[PDB]
């Protein structure tokens, strides 16, 4: 198992940008799909990217493409979101959660994944 805590949560104008890290601790970082979420006001958790094992792709929802981008650091066993040109309707809180165990199962969907951090919070102001 792995454990997984957010930083990088704050404020942000509209336009701006933001980055999201999370810092996995335990033994076998580069065998886990590790995932970004975010829960806004009043609706479900939403997935946002997913990087592969080997970090060789990684899957964007359509809400985000262009200006959110997962990269990872082994060595720092850390996964980073950046985000660019928020708009107020990326408030909301975000997550990251890991998967290591193989099958069937979805990359996007909360519910598909074992492990998951506390949560950071990002609002953009206008």
């Known amino acids: 198992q792995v454990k997984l805590v957010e930083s990088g949560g704050g404020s942000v104008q509209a336009g701006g940008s933001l980055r999201l890290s999370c810092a996995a601790s335990?033994?076998?970082?580069?065998?886990?799909?590790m995932a970004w979420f975010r829960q806004a006001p009043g609706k479900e958790r939403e997935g946002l990217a997913s990087?592969?094992?080997?970090?060789?792709?990684?899957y964007y929802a359509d809400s985000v493409k262009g200006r959110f981008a997962l990269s990872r650091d082994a060595a720092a066993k850390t996964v980073y979101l950046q985000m660019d040109n928020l708009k107020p309707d990326d408030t909301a809180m975000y997550y990251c959660?890991?998967?290591?165990?193989?099958?069937?199962?979805?990359?996007?969907?909360?519910?598909?994944?074992?492990?998951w951090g506390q949560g950071t919070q990002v609002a953009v102001s206008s």
């Open positions: 959660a890991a998967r290591s165990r193989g099958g069937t199962w979805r990359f996007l969907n909360s519910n598909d994944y074992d492990y």
């Open positions: 990087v592969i094992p080997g970090g060789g792709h990684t």
């Open positions: 335990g033994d076998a970082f580069s065998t886990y799909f």
